[PDB]
Design a protein around this ligand. Structure first.
Ligand SMILES: Nc1ncnc2c1ncn2[C@@H]1O[C@H](COP(=O)(O)OP(=O)(O)NP(=O)(O)O)[C@@H](O)[C@H]1O
Ligand SMILES: Nc1ncnc2c1ncn2[C@@H]1O[C@H](COP(=O)(O)OP(=O)(O)NP(=O)(O)O)[C@@H](O)[C@H]1O
Ligand SMILES: [Mg+2]
Ligand SMILES: [Mg+2]
Ligand SMILES: [Mg+2]
Ligand SMILES: [Mg+2]
Lengths: 258, 258
């Protein structure tokens, strides 16, 4: 009569956060199976959009409408960028890098390429320079509950005039209130964290910082990186971040093993 | 007086396909520099959208509106998928794979994960099953004029009813006429190529094919893969595909080394 742990795990895979003892496993499972197939049928009949693609489109519109230039830069980057970011073997991230070939890696962050664009664009664009990128990033991780090895970052930045902590907090606040995500900014160049409960949604920086010089910067700047799968996890109340990932196993949080 | 080859290369970097002897290099270069900065200024002032992100959004809308479910699946995939696609050391692609770790690689195509979704979705969705994905793909290449090692694929597919060569050609035709790209379908399970002059835009398949069985398929299907950077190259008349790539060196076809 009591469900086994295995049976409970199985049912939890099929449980949407929205769902609301007695019946056997086969019955509980059968109920959940037809609910999930119905959810997928409804997606297919109406909207047809993937959550992660749709979030990316919504965030792009948010930033484009606020004067930020949309960037798409390489995902496979020179290994030299990692060192140049100050990620020496004395840091946590140095062990988390997926290397490709002798000279390349999968980007673990958007910073290097956005530094390069800020430098280059300063030669062409009026002050302030406002840019952002959304795209895949990669880190080896132990955790599986709040972490993915393949994830998606948003990074926005501004360089020149108006690069204040007040302006930075205001962008973050307008951003998260637009998405409808509850948050807290925590802090004391300047570095702050945007938290949902104990989940880190973003880390943000008020520059200048000494690293800028390695990238040829020399102007004040503000910026923040957010993980889109964490935003989805929070917004859709997914218990595990795997429901928000690029995946063959979940589609918009619905199990595909039906 | 005659421009050197180096000087000509430099000026060609700054030449947009749209542009229209006597003056020295410094003058020619200076003219082109202020034109390119002006192009970037105009992008920044008005639209702010990256070509590759914008093309992806336009193609997504095209397919979503035609009843295709939007998929986002992993870019880092099991190495076993490559073998399972029938890419043995007797093929060209086997040498083109970027391996990561012992067990992984960067996807060189979208097929494996879309096979997996067609199988899984058949258990939930009504006939026909219509899906697509747009995203990064990776192959080691010698060529640099029509090829990128980091590129972006669109793959759409349909499985079940209506999986005919006529329907396949019609989707392709409506698709490319929508984008405004000139093409020719060339062919004779069934395999056709969509060509722009001598440039291959797409390869398309009318299934079933014997490979399907390895992926648990067993239904008729149609599908095609297009490279988005080739579509941009053709549409914007870029002479080299690097102008259409994720890049620190070009933005919407405009040199960032100004
Ligand atoms: N492995 C991951 N999976 C999903 N999101 C991630 C992952 N790593 C980082 N992020 C997101 O990227 C944002 C900025 O990156 P960063 O500040 O470098 O992360 P971090 O400091 O390693 N955070 P954490 O590992 O939770 O302590 C983070 O706040 C997360 O939202
Ligand atoms: N390296 C690349 N760079 C840009 N686009 C590519 C690249 N490789 C493949 N594609 C695109 O993906 C589409 C389908 O992939 P596929 O049919 O496997 O390419 P292919 O047969 O290797 N074509 P090619 O190498 O030009 O002879 C191709 O028609 C191209 O539009
Ligand atoms: Mg971390
Ligand atoms: Mg952090
Ligand atoms: Mg090839
Ligand atoms: Mg081909």
């Amino acid at each position: 009569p009591a469900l086994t742990k295995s049976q409970t795990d199985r049912l939890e895979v099929l449980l949407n956060p929205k769902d609301e003892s007695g019946k056997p496993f086969r019955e509980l499972e059968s109920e959940l199976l037809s609910r999930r197939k119905k959810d997928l049928q409804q997606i297919y009949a109406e909207e047809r959009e993937n959550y992660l693609g749709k979030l990316e489109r919504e965030i792009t519109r948010f930033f484009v409408d606020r004067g930020f230039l949309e960037i798409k830069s390489p995902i496979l980057i020179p290994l030299e960028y990692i060192e140049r970011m100050g990620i020496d073997n004395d840091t946590e991230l140095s062990k988390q890098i997926f290397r490709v070939d002798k000279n390349f890696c999968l980007r673990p962050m958007l910073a290097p390429n956005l530094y390069n664009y800020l430098r280059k664009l300063d030669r062409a664009l009026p002050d302030p320079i406002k840019i952002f990128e959304i795209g895949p990033c990669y880190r080896k991780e132990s955790d599986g509950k709040e972490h993915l090895e393949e994830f998606t970052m948003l990074n926005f930045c501004q360089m020149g005039s108006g690069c204040t902590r007040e302006n930075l907090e205001s962008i973050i606040t307008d951003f998260l209130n637009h998405l409808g995500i509850d948050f807290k900014i925590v802090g004391d160049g300047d570095t702050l964290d945007v938290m949902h409960g104990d989940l880190e949604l973003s880390s943000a920086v008020v520059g200048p910082i000494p690293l800028d010089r390695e990238w040829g910067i020399d102007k004040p700047w503000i910026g923040a990186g957010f993980g889109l799968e964490r935003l989805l996890k929070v917004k859709h109340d997914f218990k595990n971040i795997k429901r928000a990932a690029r995946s063959g196993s979940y589609y918009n949080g619905i199990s595909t093993n039906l």
